[PDB]
């Protein structure tokens, strides 16, 4: 039962982005800010924790193995408990008598729930938010714009049949007259917007309803367009992301972690290093990162922490230093006393 502090840096091999529902607004996709509009955005610890939890779940299903057809012995409930942390059958209650002193045994049998916790079982791992070291280190990426394939290159006309060419041309004409219709609907919309804010109280309520019905009108025009239910040649909203090579200080801690739980965490980071992807926009290869963490422990009562090693995740490999981390991984791998169905 030793507390491991993984203090280290995540360098951003490819832009690191995340769409936090709070952080995003109608203004545009914005990274979750570290307090206020103008603070330094961080990468949420929730996303890193989810990625590492799914990595540990894949580790556990790989160690348990698969049958001849390739189906894991676990059921849907066990998968959701192991990685998602949600109970499908309702077998999770907080502060209920009977689970007193059953938590230790369950943690020993289920290192995954021990580390990442469940509803009522405190998770031993805490995956801190990634704070950039230096200013700037965030900016607008992606963007671009969808376009008509055949307008960009004309070689694709010789592949499309004259009836399909007719469908193309009709798609263009209709998308264009719909675009101007939506344009003037948007002009009315923004005109309304100007008063939506400048107004008296509950005068604006009516304007909220007006914009809602104008958006139902927008949907109606969508349905009217025919063919494409949307606008083919449309600009893509840029998404804020951390620039490549960005240094993000990361502090994770596992509270009173057995050698088995620590080994499961390290194997989870090893498996995560195969696809070192955090966040979203994986289509743009966003989220690929190399990360070095100095694992330091602090025996309670001692004044200084001792460094058990460094775990470096790199595209060239996973570097594990210090015999303590190796012994943790070996302890986790060797232990055959793990029941993931409880």
């Amino acid at each position: 039962m030793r507390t491991l502090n993984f203090n280290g840096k995540i360098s951003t091999l490819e832009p690191l982005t995340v769409t936090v529902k709070n952080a995003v607004s109608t203004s545009g996709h914005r990274l979750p800010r570290n307090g206020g509009f103008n603070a330094a955005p961080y990468f949420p610890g929730t996303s890193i924790r989810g990625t590492l939890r799914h990595a540990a779940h894949k580790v556990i299903v790989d160690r348990v193995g698969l049958n001849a057809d390739g189906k894991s012995p676990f059921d849907l409930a066990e998968h959701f408990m192991l990685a998602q942390g949600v109970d499908i059958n309702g077998e999770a209650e907080t502060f209920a008598p009977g689970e007193i002193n059953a938590g230790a045994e369950l943690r020993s049998k289920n290192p995954l729930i021990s580390l990442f916790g469940r509803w009522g079982l405190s998770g031993k791992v805490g995956i801190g938010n990634a704070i950039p070291d230096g200013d700037n280190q965030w900016g607008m990426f992606g963007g671009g714009a969808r376009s008509i394939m055949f307008q960009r290159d004309e070689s694709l006309m010789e592949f499309l049949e004259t009836d399909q060419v007719d469908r193309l041309e009709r798609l263009l004409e209709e998308q264009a007259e719909a675009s101007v219709d939506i344009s003037q609907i948007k002009t009315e919309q923004d005109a309304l917007k100007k008063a939506m804010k400048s107004a008296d109280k509950d005068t604006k309520a009516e304007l909220q309803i007006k914009v809602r019905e104008l958006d139902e009108k927008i949907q109606a025009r969508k349905d009217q367009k025919q063919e494409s239910r949307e606008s083919i040649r449309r600009p893509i909203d840029p998404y804020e992301a951390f620039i490549t090579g960005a240094e993000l200080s990361h502090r994770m801690s596992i509270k009173n972690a057995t050698d088995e739980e620590a080994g499961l965490f390290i194997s989870a980071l090893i498996r995560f290093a195969a696809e070192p992807r955090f966040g979203g926009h994986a289509n743009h290869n966003c989220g690929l990162v190399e990360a070095h963490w100095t694992v330091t422990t602090w025996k309670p009562g001692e004044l200084v922490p001792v460094t058990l090693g460094e775990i470096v995740i790199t595209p060239n490999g996973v570097e594990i230093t210090g015999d303590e981390l190796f012994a943790m991984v070996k302890a986790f791998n060797e232990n055959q006393s793990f029941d993931f169905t409880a």
Binding site: A199, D200, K201, D202, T203
Partner: protein, 104 residues
Amino acid sequence: QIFSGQWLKAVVEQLSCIQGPALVLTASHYETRMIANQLGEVSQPVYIQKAGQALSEIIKQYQEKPGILISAGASVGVSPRGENGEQIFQDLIITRIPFLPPDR
């Protein structure tokens, strides 16, 4: 700023009981809008001062056809007097005393 529904019902009731042209001086344009919403226009034409409108347009809307004129704010030393000059609203309904909000 929620107006109790019972008071709204009483106010519309007393407004509709008027048998002639009247001038209703509400306190807020928000009160103007809620009172107009709650009114069923059973009486002769109801003329409403939209938030941030100009009173004189409703004045000259009202001279051609006297009726019930709900105009918050307004006033500032003005009067919906007729063309030659005569009292064209025998009733004047001050719904609430225009109590100024508390200003921290």
